Each structure stands twice: as C-alpha cells, then as structure tokens.
Paper text:
Ovalbumin-related protein X belongs to the serpin family (SERine Protease INhibitor, I4) and more precisely to the subgroup clade B serpins, also known as ov-serpins. However, OVAX possesses antibacterial activity against Listeria monocytogenes and S. Enteritidis, and this activity is blocked in the presence of heparin glycosaminoglycan.
A cationic domain present in OVAX, but not in ovalbumin or in OVAY structures, is likely to be responsible for this antibacterial activity, as it could explain the interaction of OVAX with the negatively charged bacterial cell wall. X-ray structural analysis of OVAX complexed to Fondaparinux (a synthetic pentasaccharide derived from heparin) confirms the ability of OVAX to bind glycosaminoglycans in a region that is close to the cationic domain that was initially predicted to bind heparin. This mechanism of action of ovalbumin possibly involves acidic amino acids that would bind Ca2+ cations. The analysis of OVAX structure also reveals the presence of several negatively charged regions. This observation, together with the capacity of OVAX to bind heparin and possibly eggshell glycosaminoglycans, should stimulate studies to further explore its role in eggshell mineralization. For certain proteins (OC-17, VMO1, OCX-32, OVAX, Ex-FABP), 3D structure analysis reveals a clear bipolar distribution of negative and positive charges on their molecular surface. In addition, five of these eggshell antimicrobial proteins bind glycosaminoglycan moieties (VMO1, AvBD11, OVAX, MSMB3 and pleiotrophin), which opens new research avenues to explore their interactions with avian eggshell glycosaminoglycans and proteoglycans.
Residue numbers in the entry: 8 to 72, 84 to 351, 372 to 402
The structure:
C-alpha cells in the first residue's frame, strides 16, 4: 500500500527535525512525535496554496509519495486518519493520546470547504477563537485543553508572550504516552545504578532489569546495539539504540538518517536471543516552539505575512503565529544490554513501521 510511502515520509521528516532540534537542544533529553507533527502540518497543508503549499509539500516529503473536494493529497489525509485511529485507541495498560488543533482568529472567516474537510479528515482539529480582544483568555483555554488531553503532564504549552491581539493562527500539537512492558520487569529487581552521562559525570537512576528473550541487533562495526522491546498491549514497540562507547552517541547522531536506521534495523540483522536488559525508568516531558525549526526546513512562508493559506480563509492577513509541540512519554514496570550512558530511542507502530516518538535519553 501507499502507507509505506507515508511511513517513509514520516521517517525522513523525523530525521530532518532531529537534525534541527539537536542544534539547540544539546546535552539534554529530546522527545518528540514526528507523526503527530506531520499530521498537524498536513491539516494546514490541506488549506495552503501557492508558494506556501509548495514549500510544505517538499519539506514534508509529500512530493515523493477531477480534483478531489479536499485536494490532490486526499489519499494522504485518509491514510493519516486511519493510522491515528489505530494507535490512539485505548487498551488495557495502553494509553496514547494525541491533541491536535489549529486555533484561528474569529475575524478570519473559515471557508466552508476547509471546515468540511477538517471535520471529515481531522475531526475536531479546528477552532475559532477571539484572539483580537481575548488573547490571554484564549491562551489559558488552549493550555487547559492541552493539559487535560495530556493527563496533566503538558502544562503552559503556550507561554505568556506567545499570543497577542495580532495572532491569527496557532498550531497546537501534543502527544501523551503511558505504557507498560510486555515482560513486566521484576519489582524486587529494579535498583538504583549510576548513569554515566560522560566518563566524568554520573547521576543515579532507577534501572529496570529484565532477563528474557529479545530481538537485538549487535553491530560492532557501527559500535552499537539496538534492542526491540515490545509493549504489553497495543501494536507499538520501543527500539533502543545504545552506543557501545560511553560517549559514542555524538558519532551516531552525526550519521543517523532514515537510510542508515533502515540498514541498522534490518530484520536480517535482528537476532532473537536471551538478553540481560538494564533500562532507566523513563518519564520524559519536552515542549518545543517549532516555528524556527520548520522555517529552517524550508517552510518559511507559513510563518511570515506572505503565507498563502487561501484554502483556509479568504481573509487578508493570515499566518501561523506559533507552532508548538508537547510530548510526554512514561514507561513503568545472556548478552548484556546496559543502557547506562546516553542513547537514542524510538517508539514505532509495528504494523506499519511508522515512527511515533523519537528521542534522546541524555540524563536522568
Ligand atoms: C517554486 O515555487 C513556485 O513554483 C511552484 C511549482 O509550480 S510550477 O511547476 O508551475 O513551476 C508553485 O507551486 C505550485 O503552484 C501552486 C499555485 O499555483 O497555487 C500550487 O498549485 C496548486 O494550487 C493552485 C491554486 O489553487 S487555488 O484553489 O488557490 O486556485 C492550483 O491551480 C488552480 O487549479 C484550479 C483547479 O483546476 O481546480 C483552477 O481553477 C479553475 O479551473 C477549474 C476547472 O478547470 S477546467 O479545466 O476549466 O474545467 C474551475 O472549477 C475553477 O472555477 C477555475 N477557477 S478560475 O479562477 O481559474 O476561473 C485554477 O485556474 C488554477 O490556478 C493547482 O492545480 S493545477 O491542476 O492547475 O496544477 C494546485 N496544484 S496541486 O495541489 O498539485 O493539485 C502548488 O503549491 C504547486 O502546484 S504543483 O503542481 O504541486 O507544482 C509555486 O506556487 C511557486 N511559488 S512562487 O515562485 O513564490 O510563486
């Protein structure tokens, strides 16, 4: 299916974003959802025209994957909708929530066709609010909604300086994940161990310990191991990319991209074997203003007054004032796999190999 094209675009976009994010987010944890971001932008893209549309099409890698009422990319919006409904369905011991919303200044009338397309393809994804004379109340309402959707974890996503009387569009995107390990780690076996941030800096961390059969890629020439950890319920799994050397992370961050990740995680390289796993208990929250990042990736017009969103509104002045992303991830409970120094990780949707979260664990 073309779903593989959308999965590949998401991964290519994921590493485009990582390349920008790590410039400004050095020596700290990173956590974001390329999937929820690309879906948020796809919803905007549906209403973009001219150069703004062209820039988004290239930056989102849609150009590599009788006009329909919701545009030529209607098949892409449909695939995103079907994918999101799969992974956000709540199960026992599985909670993944995505909050995705474009807020529009009420004096910019929304074209009926765009409202219809959003209702069918991105339901509840568009709201009109009075930024002009109630921008601070609108901000608190938006932040409350994000806080509610993320089970209290993503607070104050839109900071006080971010909205004013001139705000016309705000793109808000948040993702929440709380999962449980398929092999429930022994409660009487998790213990406090040193996490070696560098060879010189150590911080204590609560380490989950598991001795079980896992798929693992052992790649000496790449100086890494990659462990697959299934979740208890749902169709998601975590991959952990552990550098062999204590500070081997930078070398891997310099070279990783979609093609390399595919080579390193090739099912032919994966072997099912008994592994003694030490993994830090992970509870990571990160918030990003993605405006600069997305402009640097080539979507400049979307965030300045020459934005062309005339598929959203006919109004004279429209642009995205802020694109903000909040991500929360929590996990709770032979060859060695001792993740006690900085590493990369991702959460993927197994049926489609789509990357849902990508991140760096730098320090407890
Ligand atoms: C580097 O960037 C620069 O170049 C790129 C690349 O373009 S290039 O290869 O030509 O060099 C530019 O990006 C491309 O162009 C964009 C753009 O021109 O807006 C954009 O194209 C998409 O949006 C166009 C505008 O849509 S609209 O709704 O805002 O009007 C659209 O063109 C229009 O299509 C409609 C249509 O067919 O529905 C036309 O409407 C008219 O025809 C209908 C019936 O047709 S019929 O044959 O007579 O029966 C009527 O129902 C309708 O009433 C009627 N309206 S009327 O006012 O004209 O009378 C309309 O005339 C067209 O202008 C594009 O559709 S297309 O089929 O004509 O190509 C649409 N392309 S799509 O999304 O791919 O399907 C895109 O961003 C991009 O298009 S591309 O093909 O992907 O490359 C970029 O703008 C430019 N930037 S710049 O340098 O800064 O300027």
């Amino acid at each position: 299916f073309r779903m593989g094209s959308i999965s590949a675009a998401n991964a290519e976009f994921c590493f485009d974003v990582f390349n920008e994010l790590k410039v400004q987010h050095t020596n700290e944890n990173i956590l974001y959802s390329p999937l929820s971001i690309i879906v948020a932008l796809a919803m905007v893209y549906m209403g973009a025209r001219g150069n703004t549309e062209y820039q988004m099409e290239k930056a989102l890698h849609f150009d590599s994957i009788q006009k329909p009422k919701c545009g030529k990319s209607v098949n892409i919006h449909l695939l995103f909708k079907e994918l999101l409904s799969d992974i956000t369905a709540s199960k026992a011991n599985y909670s993944l929530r995505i909050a995705n919303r474009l807020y529009a200044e009420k004096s910019r009338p929304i074209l009926p066709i765009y409202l219809k397309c959003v209702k069918k393809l991105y339901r509840a994804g568009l709201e009109t609010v009075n930024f002009k004379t109630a921008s601070d109340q609108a901000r608190q309402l938006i932040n409350s909604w994000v806080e509610k959707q993320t089970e209290g974890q993503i607070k104050d996503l839109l900071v006080s300086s971010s909205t004013d009387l001139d705000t016309t569009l705000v793109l808000v995107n948040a993702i929440y994940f709380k999962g449980m390990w398929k092999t429930a780690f022994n409660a009487e076996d998790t213990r406090e161990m040193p996490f070696h941030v560098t060879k010189e800096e150590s911080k204590p961390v609560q380490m989950m310990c598991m001795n079980n059969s896992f798929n693992v890629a052992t790649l000496p020439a790449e100086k890494m191991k990659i462990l697959e950890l299934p979740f208890a319920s749902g169709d998601l799994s975590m991959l952990v990319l552990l550098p062999d050397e204590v500070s081997g992370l930078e070398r891997i961050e310099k070279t990783i991209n979609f093609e390399k990740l595919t080579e390193w995680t090739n099912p032919n390289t994966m072997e099912k074997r008994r592994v003694k796993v030490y993994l830090p208990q992970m509870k990571i929250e990160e918030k990003y203003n993605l405006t600069s990042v997305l402009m640097a990736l080539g979507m400049t017009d979307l965030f300045i007054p020459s934005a062309n969103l005339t598929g959203i509104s006919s109004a004279e002045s429209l642009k995205i004032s802020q694109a903000v992303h909040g991500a929360f991830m929590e996990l709770s409970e032979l060859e060695q796999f001792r993740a006690d120094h900085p590493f990369l990780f991702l959460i993927k949707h197994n049926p489609t190999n789509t990357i849902v979260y990508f991140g760096r664990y730098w320090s407890p």
